[PDB]
Design a protein around this ligand. Structure first.
Ligand SMILES: *C(=N)C1(NC(=O)[C@@H]2C[C@@H](S(=O)(=O)c3ccc(O[C@@H](C)C(F)(F)F)cc3Cl)CN2C(=O)C2(C(F)(F)F)CC2)CC1
Length: 219
């Protein structure tokens, strides 16, 4: 059996909300988010990891990430595996632009050994992973202004599709006033949503594609 409610912020596994600005770096914020969680769980340290390091260094044929043009959390993880590490944000800060790779192993703040992909569309497996492993990187359809304007309750918009366009982090789940939700960390800054968080419909037919392309890393 799994708990009815999970919120990884309560265990100190989630860093502050980030603001991607003009750069399409959602995928990199989602990926460092998930690794931040694992890093805290395995070493007791909570550190913001460098989204910029992912944006600058994985923009090549082998990965298919496009820096500020978009990218994939799975390929971010693979970059980190191949590269033997990632820097902390403090030593490799976010510039919201494409720059040339300046990774230095002397500033290595985390590693990754493998990542896990969860079954397409499977909200039960997502719930298991979120409950037992940690925060999980996911794609969502964030193409609607109703997403943009969210403030409270549970986001459910019948115009949502599985056409995912945005990488975010699920750091929990629960039921609010009768409605199951996924607790999602966005990278549109603190003023988006509820201090940078949105509760999105859970067990509603893979709503907004939230369980379509889910992954998490192992340190
Ligand atoms: C973030 N600022 C923003 N969005 C992205 O970078 C999104 C995030 C992912 S996705 O949309 O979640 C997505 C889409 C399609 C797949 O298919 C798998 C099977 C594939 F192709 F990878 F093999 C997975 C995922 Cl995770 C991708 N994405 C994109 O914008 C795209 C790309 F830039 F990475 F190519 C896919 C268009 C606005 C930039």
């Amino acid at each position: 059996t799994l708990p009815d409610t999970v919120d990884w912020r309560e265990k100190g596994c989630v860093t502050e909300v980030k603001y991607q600005g003009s750069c399409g770096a959602c995928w990199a914020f989602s990926a460092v988010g998930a690794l931040e969680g694992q890093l805290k769980l395995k070493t007791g340290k909570l550190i913001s990891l460098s989204a910029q390091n992912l944006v600058d260094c994985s923009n090549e044929e082998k990965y298919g990430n496009k820096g500020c043009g978009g990218g994939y959390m799975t390929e971010a993880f693979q970059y980190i595996i191949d590269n033997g590490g990632i820097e902390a944000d403090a030593s490799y800060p976010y510039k919201a632009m494409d720059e040339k790779c300046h990774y230095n192993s002397k500033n290595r703040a985390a590693t990754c050994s493998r990542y896990i992909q969860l079954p397409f569309g499977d909200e039960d497996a997502l719930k298991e992973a979120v409950a037992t492993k940690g925060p999980v990187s996911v794609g969502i359809d964030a193409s609607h202004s109703s997403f943009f304007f969210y403030k409270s309750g549970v986001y459910d918009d019948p115009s949502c599709t599985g056409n995912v366009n945005h990488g975010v982090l699920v750091v929990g789940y629960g039921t609010l006033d009768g409605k199951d939700y996924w607790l999602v960390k966005n990278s549109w800054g603190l003023n988006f949503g509820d201090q940078g968080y949105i509760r999105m419909a859970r067990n509603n037919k893979n709503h907004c594609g939230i369980a379509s392309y889910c992954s998490y890393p192992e340190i």
